[PDB]
Nucleic acid binder design. Structure first.
Lengths: 466, 465, 466, 465
RNA sequence: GCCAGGGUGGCAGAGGGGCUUUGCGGCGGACUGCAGAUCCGCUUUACCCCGGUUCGAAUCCGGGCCCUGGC
RNA sequence: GCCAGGGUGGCAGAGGGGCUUUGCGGCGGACUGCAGAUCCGCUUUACCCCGGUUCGAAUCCGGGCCCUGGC
């Protein structure tokens, strides 16, 4: 609550300790669902692919390459100009844009247009307009989507993917330029060593013998459940465009092209093994809450609506903790004072005999651990659950005590003169006045986790209002 | 050059002042083409589309939304499940993927479509989580979409970027959309918002929730465009219709807001034509600055010898003061030895009535607004000299280097005497300067001009002993 | 509210239009304080200094310099080693660290320790440990705080400040290296042209004649209320460290040092003219809300707590708009239905005669504009206010109507049989059932802005419950 | 090299296959020191402290807090207004600023102090806004603080970075602090939190609000440190006491959370000693990789002529197969002309019983774990060859270049015959290789070794006609 | 840094060795009023900081800052 | 891509031309019970996709995918 600067200055200057100890008055007194972990700020997370793409952007930028957007939709006449005869085997792995003619009848009519199968198809077009018109060397990059049909599968390969590519245009170029660029780039993503082998594919658009495959060594990978056990993985490729191809676009200068698969680099930088689970987690049921998250989701259902009632609840737990061993039958006044224009007396009791006030589980605490919600007691048997899971800070009596106080509160509204609520055996969270949204309940089942809140609460509260 | 600390330590515990002035001996002596601005670092420049995308990724994150990647390639049955009746239409604006049959031709269409808007992918994505994650759910995604519009590029482009988000919760209203729109747009500097109901009342959104958002950005008022009052339509949103949602087993309202990246990036980076902003190479937008072109203007022939330079420096020297003398006359500029052969360097003129040096000997090469000029440093030209970039190379300079190098060629061939002249400058070559074919080919393309002319009329004589 | 996937699928497949038009049921019906602009998400803004420092970090990184932290607290023996005799005039502008000896007695005892007056004092120390031990050239930078007492002022200069400095260590160096580096850096912050003049200060730690001052041309500045009218401003300096100084630390190689004032570059990149107002806005009363922000802060005080009551309020405005011209006296039933276990009749009226039901301002709307809150009517006289300020979307009758409905709601609780609330003349927001937090009210006064909500509302509501 | 498109266009409309194989003529022919890894780009690496600061600036922004700059230099009366009684103490840990009096000496202290914690600056900053801005107010600041601790650097450092925030509102509790702590720490990968009351109950926070926050980070379990169970104290917070607040006319509770950057950055980047993480130069942490040192191993003398190379390539060639032949013997490696003078190049050996080439002629120079080795490619060495970086230069190579260049020196001096030998390699020089003084001085400093040894025993004979 | 007029209450604005403005504005309040009102009550009695002069200084003097007509 | 055993309900698990498992689990419910229970009710009657065989296929055949003992 707010307070008075002057009053506190004038009292603190005379009796500082008083003022200080009094500061407590300005703090908010919280009802159960307003207490950490039940309260929390949140923040947006970012997807591993896009994190990687942005990193890659900064990687190429820092080594002097400039950003560019190449043509994505291209007349397949360009694959023919770039591959020669091999051209027809490349277009078999491509997609053609088809449209709908000018109702329920209509059917897609293919066209000549394609969706680039790789950044190269467009580098040519883009380079043709500026290779002889810009100061040399020209260093450009583009990280963007491409398409390539893959044996009609999502498992053998996704249909779309990102390629982080670049091009170096200079008068004098050797394969040592791709190597120099491959290293200056990967070394920023943590790789420490590199090996370059010649690609047996020897593609028509690359000067023969320049098409190199690049292997990098990454620490994170060493001793990994994968095959990249030794830390080495093929992470990129490159070459020097053929003059035959450059001609078809009238490019007079030699051009080094080095590109890389973004999906794979993300899998490495963020620890994934299944490309599809990495980019499409939701769709592949790869969702997950943390114990912390689930604990925050366990809420108290019935809660006293009066400052008086909160006290009443406090008192029932207060006096239940003390006299939790008084053999039955007994009774104690937990709270007496007035609420809602009338005096009230609330008592903790046990009617049955040959036992004690509170059952042997009244003090059990609800704690989340490795995905399940347990209703357990702080025993040297549940040490791990309490030291590793996250304790909700609610015990059976706590949940009950709030139930009770809400009841006696409702009574003193319905004018009634007496109300006595009692808890017997606990089968589930409901019996402890504790709930969780229907979505969290489904996440838990979907995830094959359990709710295990059971026990002998046997706690009774008698109230008499006037 | 490297030095010795003790030397300087003691060499100055004695007399500081001289030790200090001595330091200059450690500085590199630069030959003409190793001098600013002919030397410089460069760096990557990013593209405005992508910068904007990134700015949006951050803008969505700072307001709670987590990033997701939505299905791009989709069976057209999804568009049918989401639009219902009007679906027949909607599909005429999408593309379908076709493929070449494995002959033992013509591409054979399939039932797969490229998403025309992000919504097609959102329902799919949400069906796996909307019932198992704590509410609210706030997801977003800036990604590519494909749309055929008539079949023109001035109308719109085939591919574009959508920056959109979904907001799953138990109780939503058109107000949640407005709130989000503001939180996101305020971060790009928009100051005021106005919402209006979008007439097209699409069937995928609850009736009357589809809203069009207008925003006032200060950059825009005064705009050489029609956003002159500063307002512009920049986004749209709606709450999905349970008709569509129910098709995916999503049991809660879902707000969907989205905004076109291209329009935003054009506002932010100041572009008027989308295709010029996105594909500036393909649309002739290449652009070197003045400082960049100056950087490219180099001295063609330079003296390799240490004395080769001390020479041209003198040729340029004496001919600077005695440039005015009348013809004929001749001053001795240099004398010493190179390639182990003592020589004498002379600045001269033979003809009569004229003078030693033409009147353009001290004209400096300077770049301004894309053109390379060769002009004298007169008040008539201050603007060019003070807002353009002066190459630092004058007509004599360009020359004195060609001279001092031609004598170095005399000594190499045992020869005994050589005399190279200089009269009328019709260009850069004539002044011993060049620019690489690509920058020349650039200056042409950008319809720019080189104007290096003038009366140099300065001759050099030297004979190697 | 949530809904049923199956029920909606099975009805939409048969009668799509029905389902669709029915979708409206799942939308939340909002009470007045839950309507935009009264609702809004927010986000953290960043300070111009730190934005700039981070930009500068990326600027040096992209041009191949590496990050370093230099010594900030230094034995003044280092100024003596670096400046020679000029050393004592440099330490007069410095701060010495003083401590408190080992109560109320105690007094600070100076020491030999200083707080670097510039990044240079520390570059020497840092460079001594690695100039001969690392591959050449060495490119390092550091953007960090420095101190320099300035004639006992905050106006003539702040005592602390950031310096974004760097060093180039190579065997061969000329002043053309500082120029090349000054440009590759500034060109990233938008400057397009540069001029370098020799600094008359000719400082002892720089090889004579190398200490260059750097002037850059920036567009943003052209035609500016400043002196940088022409777009040129001195933005950095540089030099080549003296061998005399390098020796004192045993540095054998030549070193180029170029640094820059971060505060000034921020002022340019974010449009400020007073350094102190830029870094310490709060302290200099430079705070500010937007009309949008203030509009969001105008809340409705008394609000119906029953779905029934919201309707009642809706009806009073409903029937007040229609019959707002019926000469007095008159009366109309606005709403009749039951609320809280009893039937209720609410009427709009005017008891006085020779006028009409509603006053001539009942429809005035509260709109924020250029900082003041106005209670005005959509007249071709207030076009600008409505087209430029931000309309709250609340008019006198709206605020009142909610008051009323809350009253009749309270009545039907106190069992009462009749209640009649009436609005006469409006002097302020209070009279329209509209408030603003005490802080926003103070911001408005502090900012010298006004609240101008006046007018003849004269609206009456009679209710009769049973 | 540049080429002609028509040439290749037609030159292949005829026979593609050959036009393709022809392209290789456009590739640059690289001399030894222009080959990978002797060539490479480099780039700036950022410092872990500053990266962490930046990561925190983002972390605070994504949770609502706006950035502010707080007063650093402050009159000690503020510490007195905020701590009250215990203020006497608190000031003994701060520094005071002293200055030299303008003689017509010793520094004269003033009453100004460098802030030891961020709180000293927060009250000042908040007094101007806590009553005039809409609540809540959420501010933060990652900046420098000064603190004397005993007078040791192993204990703590004099300066450090504080990442802190304030949260002004009408109703706060210890819960707001925990919530914020989680929102901020979760973004650095901490998964579980435990809060405990800080015993020191400082007077600037309401009694019993001062909390110590412990967080579980997965990197930390297994930790070669004592955070082995993964938990660590990483931040602290409290709600200010109105005793302090009232001194500034702030009428609302204020939550203050703060966390040390240095500890966080050490966790994130894996450092055990703060001063080694912050000042790695001053504490000998310089570190070149293997690939970086390989890059620095260069061929000292290289043949300038085009044929100068075609030569050494052959010297290296024939001596590769016929390396095994017994002594004496002699093979003709090259014959053609350079500097316009036909010559013959021979690989030979005179002595007896031995062989042409020593047995270490094919030893490759490779870098591994900081040391430069000269070893043969045997299974005994795979680990070195497969995890280190092979310079690509073998003993003969290093040599054949020295040879082919010594004959180029024979032709330059009109001479007619020269013969250079090669026996026992005691090092890098002996194999015609060098590393710059700085990398050598580095390898020493990092107590690393160079091991270039072996029986080369290979001699070259050639006579220029 | 050199000559000079000067630093008054939230804004404004005269003034002047002791009491002393005034306007705007504000906030509290009253009203049979159908439009931006009317009226009563309201300040921390305000005159930068350090010295001097005096019984007394915002008013006088010295200095030091703070705006300037400035060189 | 080549040989072969094969793809059963949320998990598990036999089976087999028509009816047909079963265990775990779940959810709904009852209880005088002081600790993780007891009992009644509960499935979309489940057997990948396209053809064939048949009056009838999850059960038979051909093909196509999906795990494999694989070359």
């Amino acid at each position: 609550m707010k307070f008075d600067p002057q009053k506190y200055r004038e009292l603190a200057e005379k009796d500082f300790e008083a003022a200080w100890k009094a500061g407590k008055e300005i703090l908010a007194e919280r009802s159960p669902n307003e207490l950490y972990p039940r309260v929390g700020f949140s923040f947006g997370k970012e997807h591993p692919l896009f994190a990687t793409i942005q990193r890659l952007r900064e990687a190429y930028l820092s080594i002097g390459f400039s950003e560019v957007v190449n043509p994505l939709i291209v007349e397949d006449v360009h694959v023919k100009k770039q591959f020669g005869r091999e051209a027809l085997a490349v277009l078999d792995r491509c997609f053609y844009l088809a449209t709908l003619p000018k109702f329920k009848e209509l059917k897609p009519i293919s066209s000549t247009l394609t969706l680039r199968s790789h950044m190269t198809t467009g580098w040519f077009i883009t380079l043709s307009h500026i290779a002889d018109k810009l100061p040399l060397p020209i260093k450009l990059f583009s990280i963007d989507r491409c398409f390539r049909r893959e044996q009609g599968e999502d498992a053998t390969r996704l249909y779309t993917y990102f390629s982080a590519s670049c091009v170096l245009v200079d008068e004098e170029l050797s394969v040592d330029d791709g190597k120099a660029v491959a290293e200056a780039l990967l070394r920023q993503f943590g790789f420490e060593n590199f090996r370059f082998r010649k690609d047996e594919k020897r593609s028509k658009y690359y000067i023969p013998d320049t098409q190199t495959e690049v292997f990098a060594f990454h620490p994170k990978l060493v001793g990994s459940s994968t095959k990249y056990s030794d830390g080495w993985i093929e992470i990129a490729t490159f070459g020097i465009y053929s003059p035959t191809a450059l001609a078809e676009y009238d490019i007079p200068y030699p051009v080094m092209n080095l590109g890389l698969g973004v999906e794979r680099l993300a899998m490495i930088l963020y620890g994934y093994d299944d490309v599809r689970k990495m980019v499409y987690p939701q769709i592949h049921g790869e969702i997950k809450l943390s114990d912390l998250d689930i604990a925050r989701e366990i809420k108290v259902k019935e809660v006293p609506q009066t400052a008086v009632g909160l006290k009443i609840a406090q008192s029932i737990v207060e006096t239940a903790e003390k006299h939790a061993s008084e053999p039955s039958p007994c009774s104690f006044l937990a709270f007496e004072g007035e609420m809602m224009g009338r005096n009230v007396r609330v008592y903790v009791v046990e009617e049955e005999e040959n036992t004690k006030l509170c059952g042997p589980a009244y003090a059990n605490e609800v704690v989340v651990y490795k995905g399940d919600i347990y209703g357990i007691p702080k025993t040297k048997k549940w040490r791990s659950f309490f030291e590793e899971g996250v304790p909700t800070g609610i015990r059976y009596i706590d949940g009950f005590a709030y139930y009770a106080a809400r009841k006696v509160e409702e009574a003193a509204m319905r004018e009634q003169e007496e109300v006595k609520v009692k808890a017997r055996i606990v089968e589930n969270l409901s019996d402890i006045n504790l709930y969780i949204h229907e979505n969290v309940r489904r996440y838990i089942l979907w995830k094959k986790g359990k709710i295990d809140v059971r026990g002998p609460l046997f706690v009774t509260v008698k109230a008499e209002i006037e």
